[PDB]
From a paper:
One new defense system is the short prokaryotic Argonaute [name] ([name]), which is activated by foreign (plasmid) DNA to unleash its TIR domain for NAD(P)+ hydrolysis. The resulting depletion of the essential metabolite NAD(P)+ lends to the killing of the infected cell (abortive infection) as a means to prevent the spread of the invading DNA to the remaining bacterial cell population. The [name] system was first discovered in 20186 and further characterized by Koopal et al3 in 2022, who showed in an elegant set of studies that the short p-Ago of [name] associates with a [name] protein to form a catalytically inactive heterodimer with 1:1 stoichiometry. However, upon guide (g) RNA and target (t) ssDNA binding, four heterodimers transition to an oligomer (a tetramer of heterodimers) that unleashes the NAD(P)ase activity of the TIR domain for abortive infection.
Numbering used by the authors:
A (entry chain D): 301 to 350
B (entry chain E): 1 to 149, 205 to 507
C (entry chain I): 103 to 149
D (entry chain D): 3 to 38, 46 to 150
E (entry chain F): 51 to 100
F (entry chain H): 1 to 100
Amino acid sequence: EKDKFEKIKLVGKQKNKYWHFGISAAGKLYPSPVLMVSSHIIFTMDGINL
Amino acid sequence: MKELIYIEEPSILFAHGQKCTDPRDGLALFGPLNQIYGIKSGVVGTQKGLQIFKSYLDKIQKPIYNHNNITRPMFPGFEAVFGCKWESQNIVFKEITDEEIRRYLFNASTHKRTYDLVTLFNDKIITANKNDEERVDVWFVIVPEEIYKQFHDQLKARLLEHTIPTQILRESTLAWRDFKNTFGAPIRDFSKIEGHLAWTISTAAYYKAGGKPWKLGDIRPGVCYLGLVYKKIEKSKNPQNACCAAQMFLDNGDGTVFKGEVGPWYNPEKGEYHLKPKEAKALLTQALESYKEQNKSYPKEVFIHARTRFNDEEWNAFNEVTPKNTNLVGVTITKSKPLKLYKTEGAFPIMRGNAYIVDEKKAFLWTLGFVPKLQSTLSMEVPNPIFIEINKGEAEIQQVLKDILALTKLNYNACIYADGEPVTLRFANKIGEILTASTEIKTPPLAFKYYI
Amino acid sequence: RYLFNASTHKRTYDLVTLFNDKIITANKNDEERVDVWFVIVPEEIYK
Amino acid sequence: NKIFISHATPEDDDFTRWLSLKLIGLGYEVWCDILFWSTIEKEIRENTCKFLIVSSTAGNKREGVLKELAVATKVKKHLQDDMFIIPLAIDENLSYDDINIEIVRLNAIDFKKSWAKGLQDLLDAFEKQNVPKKPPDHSKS
Amino acid sequence: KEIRENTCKFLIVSSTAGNKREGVLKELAVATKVKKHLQDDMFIIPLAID
Amino acid sequence: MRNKIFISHATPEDDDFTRWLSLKLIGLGYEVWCDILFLDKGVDFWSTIEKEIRENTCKFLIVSSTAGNKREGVLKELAVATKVKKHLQDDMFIIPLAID
Ligand SMILES: [Mg+2]
């Protein structure tokens, strides 16, 4: 709703394009079992079409 | 909650035996350590390149201000800072006509155009060097806009053949306002950073002319510092992997030595970023003799670091050639392992110098971040840490981290606060890039003036 | 070591090699600039 | 045994820090507003030895520098010394014929071309006029 | 302000008290500076009264 | 104290010759007053010049060139020199030097 989950926006507008927030993940086990998440921005044109 | 230790930032020694942290701030108050009486320049470019160079060299004789003088200190002027005379009148000029440039760049080829341009510039420089009376210390190659659109490495290697210091300066750097382009705005506006460009150019020119800007003081006496970088010469026939090194040891007293250790030792395999026993023995023997010729004694510890691991086949050779009680330590410095630390309250990033110790053989050094003195970030977005691992040997992790900061504080090519990795690796990579484009150079010089 | 014994040509070649090796090594493996090099020949080398 | 430097507050500042620290390095006790109103007037009278005034377009009309200059002139007329005021020209957009009175009759030093030459001639003048000094203590700067 | 913006013809009295007084000398210096900017040779007209 | 040897020149050019002459004369043992070497900083510009010309100059040397002979300061010092020469009744007081 309103492109914001918990008052934090995860999709907006860059001129004629729309920008989305994306994350990745990867396992790791030496220090402790963790899930390393990396941040990305994914751009679309209409908002549903990449 | 895990605790991050703090490593106090190292200090560099300027003139008069005084210490500081920012080279830009320590050179202005005290100055360089050695006395060179002047820099006699030489220009190889078009006549408009000569006009641009003389205009810039006259402009930098007087103070230049930045927009923010806390993040980017102002420039007092060349003579005020360095105590030298780099004038725009004692200038040796060798002209390149526009007809020659057009003839050599009209159609030709790619590897033929680059070769022809390099031959032209090198012929001018070498001819002026061998048959002439006037002395030139640094040669300034003013490259027009149509030439820089591979050439730099070829030029530097083919001049390395005769050991002539050189500095390439495109016309867009010195005359950024004239090359408007776009719709009326400069392609790269320097308006707010014009005090940093002068600082960097002046310090590069001073170093390449036999000057000593600053020196390190807080490093363990006796120990050496070797940095190995592997480059893929496989672009040509007989694919191979060349290795290059760089040594940073301390003089017998009150001195610093920072040279290269080259003669690149190849590897016939494809993905084997490693070294053969004989090549490893040769490298260690050469480095040890280089140290012993200066300090008149053998080292106490050898501190080998690289971006890759060390296998047991080379470390055995290293221990076979090491004499007496010279210990060895192998360190691996990865750069982009995905760990990012945020700040819970604030829009500013984590302070530089914070170290997260995972194990007694591993750590997470933070080289980029927020510097309180500059009140700004050394990077963009959230800084990334380097990963330090004591691969082979026995040593304390905190001492290794302190040494890594000390190595980080030794960049002569640019005048900045610090880097994000030890400068030995970066200079070894530069040397390898220069030597790859060459054609079988035997016994190259060990001085960074000819490469950097 | 180099001056004593050996042929008249060999000893001269050895001394020249020593001096010029020092000069060239200093030229390419050092940072300090030297405009002109001075060779202070000892007395025994001349004869 | 002091040296007084007058300058504009928001402009002509970096030059003052540079000059003050350089002169402190060689052993010349300088009294500048950067390092630290009645105190200024007492130091111009009973403490200072040479009064240096910075000339610039931003300056040359500021009230504080003018008042300090007036006090320095009054002290000079009593101390019997013709080299009490030494103007320093640190601009390039103000002519030598637009300088205000009370200093317009004094030959400047022309820091305009290069600051190192100005510092060298300043030190030569101090050595010629016997300004007191202490051995160089570069740690203090 | 008057010597540089409002005057039209400087006049200076010459006497054994004058030609050595500080204020007269300073006004003379300012008048000479204004003289070159205006390009009028007959700007300073001395008056000899002693 | 008429022992100094005043030397006049032009401001932007005709300075190297004056420096050479002053250095040679001082090396020879004379006493020379010049605007380049002497005239310490912070001093009144013209009062000291007048005092030196009147009460201290044994001889007055003026360099003549296309640069000089039309500059205001040179003519001013020349007028004062002529006045002092008339007062002193010394025929050989102004010695021109034609460098050009
Ligand atoms: Mg460079």
